[PDB]
């Protein structure tokens, strides 16, 4: 679940970020969690230190996803804290 956290540690007020996410459509929300098992378990590979080809390979064998989509997004959600992830990925272009 993107549960709901503890709001407590952040410089910026996100009830503005997940106001957004609450107004959003279902079909957006449901967007951003088909796209946030893929980041995460690309994030587990990394750390195991595998190959980026082999890892972003594996992850678009499994998922069918572009491996060049998902590598640009996973660096744009660096800078954003895991639990807004979610919310980010509402923010689409």
Not at 42 to 63: C, P, R, W
């Amino acid at each position: 679940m993107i549960a709901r956290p503890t709001l407590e540690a952040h410089d910026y007020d996100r009830e503005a970020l997940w106001s957004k996410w609450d107004n959003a459509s279902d079909s957006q929300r449901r967007l951003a969690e088909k796209w946030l098992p893929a980041v995460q378990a690309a994030d587990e590979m990394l750390n195991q230190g595998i190959s980026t080809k082999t890892a972003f390979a594996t992850v678009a064998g499994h998922y069918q996803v572009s491996a060049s989509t998902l590598r640009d997004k996973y660096y744009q959600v660096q800078k954003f804290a895991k639990p807004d992830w979610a919310a980010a990925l509402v923010d689409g272009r």
